[PDB]
């Protein structure tokens, strides 16, 4: 889908590292994602892809791989 | 009385103003709307500082409370406005008991503490 190509080149500008061949990093025990980069997803996947997420929805536990981070994105969508 | 949780947070200015200048809606995802009426009326110098401020204090008080930022304690249950003397206060949060917040920055960087109490 276009739908995980856009999640994947949002977290690769977040992180600065491509991630399609490492989808089961963690990315924020690697020190790629922090907090504010974890905001910052949400308000790309609102403006890029018009797909909401509230911070309701968001647990850092199951967003933090870029794997689960396309799956509950695709679901979503 | 005992402590229940503590939190600080270190966060760079200029990460922050970045996020702004791209045009990205993070007042709106990470104010309330008291918070974000303060914002409105302050000079980009003044709005990078506060907008700093506010997502350091927020992260602070989430770690206190002992989950992170999101199902448990999300940005909009946090609400933190200045006295008419300056001084921060936590006006509305989720926790059942005393809330310590506390704020300071330079030009460059913004760092909270907040200390949550059980009684
Ligand atoms: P968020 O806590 O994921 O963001 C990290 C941060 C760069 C914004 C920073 O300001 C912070 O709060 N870091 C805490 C993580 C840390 O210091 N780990 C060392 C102990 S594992």
Known sequence: ?????????????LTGEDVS???????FDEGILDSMGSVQLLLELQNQLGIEVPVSEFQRSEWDTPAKIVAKVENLQ | MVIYGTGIDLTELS??????????????????????????RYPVKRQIEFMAGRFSAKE??????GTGIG???????????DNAQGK???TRHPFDGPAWIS???????????????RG
């Open chain 2, 88 to 90: 921060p206060e936590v």
């Open chain 1, 1 to 13: 889908d276009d739908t995980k190509a856009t999640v994947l080149s949002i977290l690769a500008d």
């Open chain 1, 21 to 27: 061949s490492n989808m089961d990093v963690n990315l």
């Open chain 2, 60 to 65: 602070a008080y989430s770690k206190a409370y």
């Open chain 2, 15 to 40: 990460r922050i103003e970045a996020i702004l200048a791209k045009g990205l809606r993070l007042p709106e995802k990470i104010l309330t709307p008291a918070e974000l009426a303060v914002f409105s």
């Open chain 2, 71 to 81: 199902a448990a304690v999300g940005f909009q249950d946090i609400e933190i406005l």
């Open chain 2, 103 to 117: 704020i300071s920055h330079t030009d460059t960087l913004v760092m909270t503490q907040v200390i949550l109490e």
